[PDB]
Amino acid sequence: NPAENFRVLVKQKKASFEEASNQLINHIEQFLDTNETPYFMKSIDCIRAFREEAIKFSE
Amino acid sequence: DSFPQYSPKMQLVCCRAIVKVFLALAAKGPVLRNCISTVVHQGLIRICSKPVVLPWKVPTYKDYVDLFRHLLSSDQMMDSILADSLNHLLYDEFVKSVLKIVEKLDLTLEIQANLHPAKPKDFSAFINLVEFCREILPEKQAEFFEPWVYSFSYELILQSTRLPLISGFYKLLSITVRNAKKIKYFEGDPEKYSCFALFVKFGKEVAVKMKQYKDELLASCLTFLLSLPH
Amino acid sequence: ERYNYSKCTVVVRIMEFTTTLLNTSPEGWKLLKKDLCNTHLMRVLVQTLCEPASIGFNIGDVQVMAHLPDVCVNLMKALKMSPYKDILETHLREKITAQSIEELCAVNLYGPDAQVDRSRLAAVVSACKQLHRAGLLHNILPSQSTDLHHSVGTELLSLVYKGIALDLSCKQLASGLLELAFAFGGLCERLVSLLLNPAVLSTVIHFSHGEYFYSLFSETINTELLKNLDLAVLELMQSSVDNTKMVSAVLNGMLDQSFRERANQKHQGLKLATTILQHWKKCDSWWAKDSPLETKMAVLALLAKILQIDSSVSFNTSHGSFPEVFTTYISLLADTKLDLHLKGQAVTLLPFFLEELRRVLEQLIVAHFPMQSREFPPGTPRFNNYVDCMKKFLDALELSQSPMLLELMTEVLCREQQHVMEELFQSSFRRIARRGSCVTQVGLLESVYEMFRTRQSFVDRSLLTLLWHCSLDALREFFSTIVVDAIDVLKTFDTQITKKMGYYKILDVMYSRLPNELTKTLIKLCYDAFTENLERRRLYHCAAYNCAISVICCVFNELKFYQ
């Protein structure tokens, strides 16, 4: 849910935003103790969105 | 419900906000009526729901009457708001709520010349409302009660026929006769003569039935009566 | 006054005896009524009953007048089983044949203009209602030229409309003419049709009139209109595409009325609600992107009231309309454009009920927050929605306390420490562990055991309450259940030791409660596990010896612990 927060942040201010990079790192890694694949698919979807957002402007 | 347990400062702020929102809803007619009916009904439910003890913490009835006084003395804000009736509506809807809620009272009881109150929570509600209205009734006149007093006296006499064990009847009717002779309901309309006869018959029958009653009741009975007008 | 008392006493005595002369002496001895011959009673007592101004005035206004309505109905029924029923019907016809109303439609209402006219109007209203209660609904009545008696409805509508652009005395007079209207059967459909008045108000404000005219006597009007159970309601829900406030209002009126009318039979209201629940899909212009979001929560609330009013078991499984309305609810769940608050109210109705349910549960609960709530600052509207939502989840589960919902919720909180307000979480846990049947609690225990597969934080975030506040019958029977489930489970490495800690924390308490035949075996089976003397080693020592302290409680509590 904050995934789109920092996603829209990076695609409004147009920076690599390594802070947002770490935020999405948290968003994707939060599965070590978790066997609930729905989190995994949501997180991979959001990081694909951020992959193409990296593709977008400067990162 | 949050209004009690307050110190006078924020309690006054709360009552001012209450009157302000009351005006604001009054601006919306249908909303005014439905909202006031519901809130007064449920608020009286909660107030009478207050328990007592035989002779943060538990809230008291004692404060809300002061809110009603502010209701009667809240011109200082409505004038400013209308720049960019009140007590009429207050008295009206209060009468509606209190009477509609008196109607609810189921007052079954037994003796076990003893007494066995079978509806003690209803007793607590009744005494709470008696105390509150006695903190409420004395100021305001029958201006928006005089049409009501007819049906009032009627239904209170009815409840006496059901249970002649309520000092509240001629409590309300004591303040009522106060207001009536204050306006001289007596003039020597059919309602006028009929309601005179209601007074006469009711007072006479209780004045003879007094023999059956006991302390804190028969004393309430005689006070109950003596208020009756000349 | 005493003379009138004597008069009224004579009147009541003789009129009761007249009823008996019809009742105690039937048609067989109606000739004893013929002894009355002319029966000036037929021409005076009718006046007395319609107007106690004909027994004098019934001054004193005592029990006798309150007795008048029922005993008048008694007398009229006695006349009905008497040959003079037609004679008295004619008698009252010259007493009145709806002549009065033709002019009393203009009694100058809406203020203390003239009230004695209204007094006589109320008296004749009472007389008409006695006739209604005595079966003289339309017989004595000169019934309307049309089958439906507009002679009340349209006049009331017109007056209540114009005379504002109020009076509680006029209000109760309007109520009296309302019961007169109710004495006219079949009007219900007309009242439905007309009550949908788009006629807006004319003054600061402007709103349609018929809705408020209804709201004046909403409860009584609903009581009349719902004698037609749903046919009128069906007609309404045909027309409820745009206006629901009227229909929703009348719904909740009879809803809380079915509540009030539970002393006699709420199953009347239960039947009505169930029937209209069937008669939901005949209009579905709502609950999707087809109604106002306002209207969406409105229908949400109405259905919630229905679900509360009927038994939750009624249509928690396919019982007729349970598929249709249940699927509507499922849509609403999928209708995720709600505010998180609105989603919480949608949640409130979940415990009313099968895996498909759980599936929508997960696909819903995902879309709130990934793992953390502290990532959303306190005071942010999202945060407030979150906290209210977890409140809703806690209370709804506490109601249901199903093992499924329980585990779903624990998994939700099994993301961050103190991110779903774990204090209230465990308080609800305390309240549900004491709650629930022993079998239900044990099933909850099975759920927590299976979800036990940090790898320890799972059980560590939802255990003490089960270990402590479940009854020591579910607790004892679950002990018996997992005797072997622990014996076996006695025996990278981080996960292993997390499991070992979970075993510590489960086994200690279940010993400490109560002690079958594998006693010393199990005692050794636990001490050997402790016996050994990274930080996981300190955690080992502390947890193992706390469990050892437990296993001292009932055995090896004296001394000499088999060294």
Curated annotation (Swiss-Prot), chain A:
What triggers expression? In osteoblasts, by FGF2.
Q: In what way is this protein post-translationally modified? A: ADP-ribosylated by PARP3. Phosphorylated on serine residues. Phosphorylation by PRKDC may enhance helicase activity.
User: What subcellular locations does the record give?
Assistant: Nucleus; Nucleus, Nucleolus; Chromosome
What does the domain comment read? The EEXXXDDL motif is required for the interaction with catalytic subunit PRKDC and its recruitment to sites of DNA damage.
Q: Which family does it belong to?
A: Belongs to the ku80 family.
Query: What does the UniProt record say this protein does?
Result: Single-stranded DNA-dependent ATP-dependent helicase that plays a key role in DNA non-homologous end joining (NHEJ) by recruiting DNA-PK to DNA. Required for double-strand break repair and V(D)J recombination. Also has a role in chromosome translocation. The DNA helicase II complex binds preferentially to fork-like ends of double-stranded DNA in a cell cycle-dependent manner. It works in the 3'-5' direction. During NHEJ, the XRCC5-XRRC6 dimer performs the recognition step: it recognizes and binds to the broken ends of the DNA and protects them from further resection.
Q: What else is known?
A: Individuals with systemic lupus erythematosus (SLE) and related disorders produce extremely large amounts of autoantibodies to XRCC6 and XRCC5.
Subunit description:
Heterodimer composed of XRCC5/Ku80 and XRCC6/Ku70; heterodimerization stabilizes XRCC5 protein. Component of the core long-range non-homologous end joining (NHEJ) complex (also named DNA-PK complex) composed of PRKDC, LIG4, XRCC4, XRCC6/Ku70, XRCC5/Ku86 and NHEJ1/XLF. Additional component of the NHEJ complex includes PAXX. Following autophosphorylation, PRKDC dissociates from DNA, leading to formation of the short-range NHEJ complex, composed of LIG4, XRCC4, XRCC6/Ku70, XRCC5/Ku86 and NHEJ1/XLF. (Microbial infection) Interacts with human T-cell leukemia virus 1/HTLV-1 protein HBZ.
* Stated name of the protein: X-ray repair cross-complementing protein 5
Curated annotation (Swiss-Prot), chain B:
Subcellular location field: Nucleus; Nucleus, Nucleolus; Cytoplasm, Cytosol
Q: Which organism is it from?
A: Homo sapiens (Human)
What does the record note on quaternary structure?
DNA-PK is a heterotrimer of PRKDC and the Ku dimer (composed of XRCC6/Ku70 and XRCC5/Ku86). Formation of this complex may be promoted by interaction with ILF3. Component of the core long-range non-homologous end joining (NHEJ) complex (also named DNA-PK complex) composed of PRKDC, LIG4, XRCC4, XRCC6/Ku70, XRCC5/Ku86 and NHEJ1/XLF. Additional component of the NHEJ complex includes PAXX. Following autophosphorylation, PRKDC dissociates from DNA. Interacts with DNA-PKcs-interacting protein (KIP) with the region upstream the kinase domain.
Top-level taxon: Eukaryota
> Post-translational modification, briefly?
Autophosphorylated at two clusters, the T2609 cluster and the S2056 cluster. Autophosphorylation induces a conformational change that leads to remodeling of the DNA-PK complex, requisite for efficient end processing and DNA repair.
Disease linkage: Immunodeficiency 26 with or without neurologic abnormalities: A form of severe combined immunodeficiency characterized by reduced or absent T and B cells, recurrent candidiasis, and lower respiratory tract infections. Some patients show dysmorphic features, severe growth failure, microcephaly, seizures, and impaired neurological functions.
* Protein's gene: PRKDC
Protein's UniProt name? DNA-dependent protein kinase catalytic subunit
- Family label: Belongs to the PI3/PI4-kinase family.
What is its biological role? Serine/threonine-protein kinase that acts as a molecular sensor for DNA damage. Involved in DNA non-homologous end joining (NHEJ) required for double-strand break (DSB) repair and V(D)J recombination. Must be bound to DNA to express its catalytic properties. Promotes processing of hairpin DNA structures in V(D)J recombination by activation of the hairpin endonuclease artemis (DCLRE1C). Recruited by XRCC5 and XRCC6 to DNA ends and is required to (1) protect and align broken ends of DNA, thereby preventing their degradation, (2) and sequester the DSB for repair by NHEJ.
